[PDB]
Amino acid sequence: IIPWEERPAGCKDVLWRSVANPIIPRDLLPTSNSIFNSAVVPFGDGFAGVFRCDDTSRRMRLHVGFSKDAINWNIKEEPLKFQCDDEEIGTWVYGYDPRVCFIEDRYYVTWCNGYHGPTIGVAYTFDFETFHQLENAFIPFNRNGVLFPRKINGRFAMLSRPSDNGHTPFGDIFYSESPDMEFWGRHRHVMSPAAFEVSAWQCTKIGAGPIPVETPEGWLLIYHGVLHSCNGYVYSFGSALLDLDEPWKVKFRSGPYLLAPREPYECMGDVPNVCFPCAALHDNETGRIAIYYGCADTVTGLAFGYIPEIIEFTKRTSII
Amino acid sequence: VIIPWEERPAGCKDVLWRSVANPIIPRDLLPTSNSIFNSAVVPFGDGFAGVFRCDDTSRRMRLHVGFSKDAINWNIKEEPLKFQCDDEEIGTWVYGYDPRVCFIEDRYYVTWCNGYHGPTIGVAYTFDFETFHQLENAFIPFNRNGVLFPRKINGRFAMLSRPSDNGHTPFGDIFYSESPDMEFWGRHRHVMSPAAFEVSAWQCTKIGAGPIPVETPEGWLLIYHGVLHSCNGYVYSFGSALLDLDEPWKVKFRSGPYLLAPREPYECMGDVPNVCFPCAALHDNETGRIAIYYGCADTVTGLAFGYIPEIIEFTKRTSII
Amino acid sequence: IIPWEERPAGCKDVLWRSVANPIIPRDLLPTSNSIFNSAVVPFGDGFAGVFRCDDTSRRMRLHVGFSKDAINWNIKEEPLKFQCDDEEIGTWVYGYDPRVCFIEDRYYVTWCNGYHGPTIGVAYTFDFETFHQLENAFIPFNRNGVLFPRKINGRFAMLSRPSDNGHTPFGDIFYSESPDMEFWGRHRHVMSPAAFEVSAWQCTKIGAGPIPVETPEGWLLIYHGVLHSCNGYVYSFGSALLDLDEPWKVKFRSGPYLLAPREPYECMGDVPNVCFPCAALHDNETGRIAIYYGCADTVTGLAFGYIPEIIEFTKRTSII
Amino acid sequence: IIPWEERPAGCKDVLWRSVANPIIPRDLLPTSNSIFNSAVVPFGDGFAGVFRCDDTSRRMRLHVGFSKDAINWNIKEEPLKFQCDDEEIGTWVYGYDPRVCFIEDRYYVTWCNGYHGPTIGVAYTFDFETFHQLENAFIPFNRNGVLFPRKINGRFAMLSRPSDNGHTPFGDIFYSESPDMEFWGRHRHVMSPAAFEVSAWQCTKIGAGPIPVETPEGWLLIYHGVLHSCNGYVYSFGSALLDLDEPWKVKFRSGPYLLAPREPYECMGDVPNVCFPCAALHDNETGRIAIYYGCADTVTGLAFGYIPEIIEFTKRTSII
Amino acid sequence: VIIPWEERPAGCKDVLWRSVANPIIPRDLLPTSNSIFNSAVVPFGDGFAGVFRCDDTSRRMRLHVGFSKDAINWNIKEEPLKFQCDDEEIGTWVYGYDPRVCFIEDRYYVTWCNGYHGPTIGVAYTFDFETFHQLENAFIPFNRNGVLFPRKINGRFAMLSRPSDNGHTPFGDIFYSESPDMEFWGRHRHVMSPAAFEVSAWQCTKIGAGPIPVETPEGWLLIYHGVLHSCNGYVYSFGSALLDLDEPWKVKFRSGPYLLAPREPYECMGDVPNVCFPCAALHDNETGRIAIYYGCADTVTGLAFGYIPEIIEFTKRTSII
Amino acid sequence: IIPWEERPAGCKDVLWRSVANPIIPRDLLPTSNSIFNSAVVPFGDGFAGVFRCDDTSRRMRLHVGFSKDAINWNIKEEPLKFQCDDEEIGTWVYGYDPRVCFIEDRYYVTWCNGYHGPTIGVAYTFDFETFHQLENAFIPFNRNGVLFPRKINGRFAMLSRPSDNGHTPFGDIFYSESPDMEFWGRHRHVMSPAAFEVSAWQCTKIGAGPIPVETPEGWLLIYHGVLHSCNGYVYSFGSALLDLDEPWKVKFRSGPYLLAPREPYECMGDVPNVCFPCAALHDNETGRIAIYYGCADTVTGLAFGYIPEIIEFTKRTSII
Numbered sequence A, C, D, F: 001i002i003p004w005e006e007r008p009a010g011c012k013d014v015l016w017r018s019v020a021n022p023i024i025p026r027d028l029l030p031t032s033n034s035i036f037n038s039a040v041v042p043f044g045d046g047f048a049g050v051f052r053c054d055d056t057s058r059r060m061r062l063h064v065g066f067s068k069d070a071i072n073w074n075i076k077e078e079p080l081k082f083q084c085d086d087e088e089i090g091t092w093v094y095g096y097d098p099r100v101c102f103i104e105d106r107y108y109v110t111w112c113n114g115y116h117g118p119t120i121g122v123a124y125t126f127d128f129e130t131f132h133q134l135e136n137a138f139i140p141f142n143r144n145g146v147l148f149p150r151k152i153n154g155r156f157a158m159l160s161r162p163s164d165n166g167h168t169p170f171g172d173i174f175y176s177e178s179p180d181m182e183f184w185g186r187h188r189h190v191m192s193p194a195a196f197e198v199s200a201w202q203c204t205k206i207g208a209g210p211i212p213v214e215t216p217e218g219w220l221l222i223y224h225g226v227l228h229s230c231n232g233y234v235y236s237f238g239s240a241l242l243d244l245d246e247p248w249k250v251k252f253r254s255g256p257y258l259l260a261p262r263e264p265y266e267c268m269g270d271v272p273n274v275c276f277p278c279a280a281l282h283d284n285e286t287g288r289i290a291i292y293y294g295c296a297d298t299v300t301g302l303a304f305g306y307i308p309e310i311i312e313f314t315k316r317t318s319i320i
Numbered sequence B, E: 001v002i003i004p005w006e007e008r009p010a011g012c013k014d015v016l017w018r019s020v021a022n023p024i025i026p027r028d029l030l031p032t033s034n035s036i037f038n039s040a041v042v043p044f045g046d047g048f049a050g051v052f053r054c055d056d057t058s059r060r061m062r063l064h065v066g067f068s069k070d071a072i073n074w075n076i077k078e079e080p081l082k083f084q085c086d087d088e089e090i091g092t093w094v095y096g097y098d099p100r101v102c103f104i105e106d107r108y109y110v111t112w113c114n115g116y117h118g119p120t121i122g123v124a125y126t127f128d129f130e131t132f133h134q135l136e137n138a139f140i141p142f143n144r145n146g147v148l149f150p151r152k153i154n155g156r157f158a159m160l161s162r163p164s165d166n167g168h169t170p171f172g173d174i175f176y177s178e179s180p181d182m183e184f185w186g187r188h189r190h191v192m193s194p195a196a197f198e199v200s201a202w203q204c205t206k207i208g209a210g211p212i213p214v215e216t217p218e219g220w221l222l223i224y225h226g227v228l229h230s231c232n233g234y235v236y237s238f239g240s241a242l243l244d245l246d247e248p249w250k251v252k253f254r255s256g257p258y259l260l261a262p263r264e265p266y267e268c269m270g271d272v273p274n275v276c277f278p279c280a281a282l283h284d285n286e287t288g289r290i291a292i293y294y295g296c297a298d299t300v301t302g303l304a305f306g307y308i309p310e311i312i313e314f315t316k317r318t319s320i321i
């Protein structure tokens, strides 16, 4: 049973913000400075997740949380530690940008893990108590690693986003596969930022957000895009539809955003003008989807909509 | 013509004061608008018309016509304005922003930052704010902040402009040019450069012309923006200068202080924080009233009021020339 | 008798903001745009200060102010002018970043003085009416000059911060001495920005804030640190303890910040996301300290704490 | 009778260097540092030109020169000074990049003229003794202004190259017309730099060189292209064919260059790795063309070819 | 195999010495070649073969096969090498540079910097140097300086690489990766970073693998390039390291001094001034002789010679680990 | 007796290169990569110097050398190590840019000393065998520190050049005084780069070269200037005359350079297009001066001229 608020009266938008935003405040932990990625999944008869909680030292750590209702979170004060046989991959430097999904028999966590710069860390859990760390999937510099929630033609699949070691001024989404969660390959380009004249909210760089959502015609991808203004980056998010069998083949890609920084909690904070989607919960029998997104790199917010309406919007407004 | 007006508050000593109704145009007036923050406004018939920059939810820059009975409450067309053009190449639409409008002699002219292998100044005319006829782009890229004078200067059309680059330009002088025919342009003259940081830092990075010049007996009143580069971005403020009536590239007085700078929440939070960008004015020489339209945070449109003679006085008193 | 508010009920922070913030508004003077450094000291029956008041031409000027309570200030409308026999040094270009302290027999004012670029200007006063300018202490480019409030083994001492001629993307704190307030030397490195992975609020650049506060466990240094986000700089502030006798030797340095931009008056304004500490009043008998800080380069705020608590926080959280 | 050297036996190149290169040395004048644009034309008995000669102050000045054979030049020691009735336009700041051609009844000179940054200066001369300055054709920033040698459908026509106020990192060629040599307009884009993967010698920026040469198949445009290596720009040059009646319409554009820096005089100098074409003399009866080019921004060189061979090369290798 | 060789010049105390015949390959060997400066060379039958980076007079980067009896005088094919691939997406040619070639078990493999939405490491194999069969690109962009080990390491193929950007990259660490199958890659391990400027400035900006690692009893001998960033550009020098045999990401010794730096006119002047870029080596374990191929000023190819044990001695003696 | 070559026949230049250049080659020492500052003085029976010799690790080290004739040098293989009781200042990181002169009773050496970035190191020797390190004169970032060869009104005096921590894109010359060779002050701006349109060889940055040369008319300062081309920096050098009593007051300053990179040893090497003057020897009786200068940051060269001729050239071509 997923978090839900009905479409506000008179609202014509395909996605609408929770009137209770933010749902997770910056100061939930005794030394939290900000809490703004919430990689959430159903777990048991409630919910679990891995949260980016930056502390008052501005260190980036991951913490486990649990919730009965997916809105009020009980986040562990101790940062998440990963078990690793290999001491060098198991060395912690930093971590941010978590994503979590269930694949076949267990939950997988990806995050941007420091190993001589940003790359994609990978781990699994059965219980959100012990996490077994796997090889980093890629060589740096890479982030916005997002696994598909089932195998594709008998291989694990992940979207990713080649980066640099700074505030990267570019970014294409890529797709890769693995037979074993250890060795990765068959890299395919998915998409590039759009031209400024076509769709400027996604003209500087783009990156995958929540775990891809399967629909009968393809994968619904919710992804961030950046616009470079004279005064900074503005992060908005939107939707695309990927081919089911070869998800690097993009079928439709929204011209308009789904959501952009509007509210004071999106516009003011540690990084102004940021809506960064990180997770979603959905129900295919009602079409309902709830999208979790970071707000100003400070707090966490929720937005709601219907999958069929998002799909119709993505096709009708498509730039491809 | 009855222009909008609010009297200055009790105890306010400022030369310009904001409308208590700001923002006068909201970001979501149209079903697909993301922001509406340039308002090129003129008297038209028994009321007012304008060309508005309305950026949509794809963050595309388009121009839309609007009409108003009082110049405060606007009815803006949902569909973007399309230009008619004799020439297919010039007529091709890439993007448009930064509109300005004025009447010269027998018709309304519209200039805008028109994409043609980069930003340049598009030119068109209209008799009715329904059909627009596009003329040659006035200049080669890169250029924007094109603003016509509202009459010919010694028998030639005249336009202020602002040589630019293809990004968020880190420099910018105002220039003046003439044309006998609205097709060929020349006699380019430098008007002014940014001020020295230690003299007037609100206008030390770059400058550009705003509203159409307003003719006064003490010269053309130019209201123009200026940029300060802080560690966290650009701050856009605006101020005033007086140009020679006959040779308007000769600046006679230029203000040290700004007239208006970002202060209010609607100016300090939005798509581009800390921007007050003036785009149009309405004025009444009988009363000396002036109403200046300005975009706020690249999100919404606001209005500010003052008196022409008080602005002239301020410009002279505080002149850095 | 220093300004004080009790720590809010339930508040676990070492420093807490005044509920009266901002204490100095942007428009206090007829031509002020912003008022955000407040170099304050006790004087006579109350308080005096040197204030950075940027005007509506965005020029950077210094003005003298007086207060009876150190909260409600009466600032002179006319900028401060300095007396100097040397016309070359005496030439005013611009001035910002003032700091003020009494040393032995008079008050000294330092500021970021334009002399072919930013350097540290120096002047004294006996009465806060007439100010007499001394030689600039250093060659450009330097700022964040902050004198010790007594001589150190017989010499005047000053912290500074080598810079460039723009929005400096680096910054270490240095220490220098002078026998005579004219010739300076014995330059020693104090500290550098921390590593991003250890303490990111202070990983781009740092600079000294208020006059050092003598304690039995060392000089308490309150200093700003910068984090470079994709959208610009975020200024926070924290604490270090310097050796009493050789103050370039850092004994303890906080990991977490003491204060970071949170309130709308800190997050929105001429320069968003800035808390810049400029002065402090303290009472060794009660342990109370009141720290003045510029907010968003627009207004002035106050924050309160106890010196023993700040000492304890600095030591327990030390990254060295 | 234009200069000529026959193609060496076995030489397969479309263009070949004079064996006498450099034809103008850097120290020809008592104060010359370098001499490296040579805007040459037939005049009377022999030849005349306008030369960029940078002095030992590294100032950029134009000088008039005369030659019997177009190879050995007698350049005037004193810079060229223009007569102008408008004192504002007639103010000399700097000048470089000259081009000279006869149109109708007199010689026109264009150059990169300082007027609050680079723009295209214009003047005329009947005798190469007195030069009369006209209005600058465009607003800054622009350079590489090159006139057509006759009117095009009753209007003067000029190629130009919108620029910035530095070492410009971009550059498209544009075309403009004027009824009167005063007011300019009908601006049209001619061509942009090529894609890196298609033709990298011309992928950063391009600019017109010699006066266009009229042929039955279009205007022969010889133009420079830049490649941005890790160690700077490399200037090469190539060929295109423009429509006769509407010269902004490009018919053919070479993939390969015609000439690139190879010789020590091209690869070592004030600006290493530069071949910058500035003029040509040609003879339609024989098809001979002689192209003048600056070498390393230090000296002037000559290269030879046949117009029909250049045309066949431009077509065969066309990237349009 | 008879590897090229010249004895050390009389009086010469350097560990490596340039051929007196340099450049051994000129820039205009082919009718349309602009420059020829990577030479990925191996023994083949009775002579030598290689894959050469020949940039053309359009300044396109292509790979060409060549053959030589002596490894000094090369017969390079006029037409660029084409790869067979049955996946059209991966088999699309955009550009290629930076080849390296070695024999592993049953065939020759060739890696190169292959354009696939930016630089990455392309991989192919050949049995005969006539037909080349392309495999998956080994990594996601941006990467280059991919260099295979000449045997499997504990049953897996192994490759050095170099994470990059899509420009003239201002950074660069060498990495190591493994693959069981020449298709999927993983077990990524950091090998080394640029040195500190105050320790060894020829290798302080970025580093990258050069020739195929050469196996010694004392480790893998890695010859690699290093960049120094002067006010006027990058200077590429090359030096030596020894890697653990079994875990080649563990560096045992790393030279402080360079082995070779741009000195000669053919190294200092050309398309990219001040570049010595090593691309291949031939060696003879019986004699200890090694011949190192290197690109000179991105224009021509040179040769340098030395003795493996003397290089090992120098690497240990001068080690900055 | 200082080295001398008479001006080549007909040569009209104020300064002329030695026909023996380069006088010091790059490979004098077993591990030298380049040898290109040579801070030279008369000593005992001949000459002594401190030389910048970068090694084959590209480390910057200073070495002592001696010569009978000041042309052919015997440079010590071992780098120079300074004696210093203070362990903090005595720590060696790197050193370059040496300058040497005799002041009153001993030889002083300054150099660009690494101390948390570049600053001016200072030391003395009586014998060119043992060198005794003093305090760094300034806080970083600074270089091109050049002492005057006597006291000025009872104080030691030094030119310097505020910098940054990279390849500095700016640079003015400053003057400072010290009563004791420990504490420094009375900082005065000497000169800034010229405007591009006035004198482009010196329009990016400038810095002092050889020790100032006393004349009856003022101090002859030989200094470098930088021009920023598209392909890098070009270092040339020229002359100014400073007031004898107040040497920050410039009396005349040359518009043209004295010398600029022309020869292959100046235009090809580790840093192309560099002539960097570092020391001079002179004879007041004859007016002869021999100027040592770094060539392409690879080798050392010599140029000769006459002090009165240099002075008249500086006056006649003065840009102030």
Ligand SMILES: CC(=O)N[C@@H]1[C@@H](O)[C@H](O)[C@@H](CO)O[C@@H]1O
Pocket: A058, A060, A096, A166, A167, A168, A297, C200, C227, C228, C229, C230
């Ligand atoms: C603590 C901090 O500033 N972290 C940021 C991270 O939030 C961001 O996503 C990345 C890219 O812009 O840069 C930094 O790693």
Ligand SMILES: CC(=O)N[C@@H]1[C@@H](O)[C@H](O)[C@@H](CO)O[C@@H]1O
Pocket: A200, A227, A228, A229, A230, B059, B061, B097, B167, B168, B169
């Ligand atoms: C869509 C968008 O971000 N447009 C901006 C425009 O508003 C701005 O005026 C111009 C110059 O700074 O840059 C961009 O074109």
Ligand SMILES: CC(=O)N[C@@H]1[C@@H](O)[C@H](O)[C@@H](CO)O[C@@H]1O
Pocket: B201, B228, B229, B230, B231, C058, C060, C096, C166, C167, C168
């Ligand atoms: C008027 C203005 O913008 N002044 C700022 C000043 O506040 C700031 O501290 C300094 C460094 O960032 O740069 C500028 O001088």
Ligand SMILES: CC(=O)N[C@@H]1[C@@H](O)[C@H](O)[C@@H](CO)O[C@@H]1O
Pocket: D058, D060, D096, D166, D167, D168, F200, F228, F229, F230
């Ligand atoms: C003196 C000097 O360096 N002049 C150059 C000029 O030669 C060049 O064409 C232009 C663009 O790169 O920049 C500068 O004006």
Ligand SMILES: CC(=O)N[C@@H]1[C@@H](O)[C@H](O)[C@@H](CO)O[C@@H]1O
Pocket: D200, D227, D228, D229, D230, E059, E061, E097, E167, E168, E169
């Ligand atoms: C054609 C051309 O300039 N190619 C270069 C290539 O040689 C170089 O290795 C790379 C990194 O600097 O940049 C470009 O791809």
Ligand SMILES: CC(=O)N[C@@H]1[C@@H](O)[C@H](O)[C@@H](CO)O[C@@H]1O
Pocket: E201, E229, E230, E231, F058, F060, F096, F166, F167, F168, F297
């Ligand atoms: C080894 C090396 O590259 N040193 C240079 C030095 O020669 C130069 O003067 C300084 C300023 O450009 O930068 C670097 O420190």
Ligand SMILES: [K+]
Pocket: A189, A190, A191, A248, A249, A250
């Ligand atoms: K795709």
Ligand SMILES: [K+]
Pocket: B190, B191, B192, B249, B250, B251
């Ligand atoms: K003017």
Ligand SMILES: [K+]
Pocket: C189, C190, C191, C248, C249, C250
């Ligand atoms: K210290």
Ligand SMILES: [K+]
Pocket: D189, D190, D191, D248, D249, D250
């Ligand atoms: K065209």
Ligand SMILES: [K+]
Pocket: E190, E191, E192, E249, E250, E251
């Ligand atoms: K390692």
Ligand SMILES: [K+]
Pocket: F189, F190, F191, F248, F249, F250
């Ligand atoms: K001076």
